[PDB]
Amino acid sequence: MKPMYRSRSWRRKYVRTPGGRVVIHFERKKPKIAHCAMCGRPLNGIPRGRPVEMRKLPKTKKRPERPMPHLCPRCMRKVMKEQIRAQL
């Protein structure tokens, strides 16, 4: 196989085509899930994928519909309560 595909950054799958031939399919590994800014906890509502897959989706299908989507719900409530208490 080609030296570029000899690297482990590609994932290799042996696929048999309709004509009976055996070919090797290559593709890039998917990125990991997004994490909370503060506690570093996995987030929700943010699908995994490469930039092409992200651009394939609309805006509302990539983040939850609530303020501060970059924080987990616990941190979001923490920040909101702290902010309102400081304001009042």
* Site for RNA contains 31 (CB under 7 A): yes
Per-residue x/- track, 46-75, RNA (CB under 7 A): xxxxxxx-xxxxxxxxxxxxxxxxx-xxx-
Least distance (Å) from RNA to the CB of residue 18? 3
78 binds, among Zn ion, RNA, none (CB under 5 to 8 A by kind): none
* Site for RNA contains 20 (CB under 7 A): yes
Q: Quote the tokens at residue 88.
A: 């009042």
C-alpha separations of 78 from 40, 68, 70 in Å: 15, 11, 13
73 vs 32: CA distance, rounded Å:
20
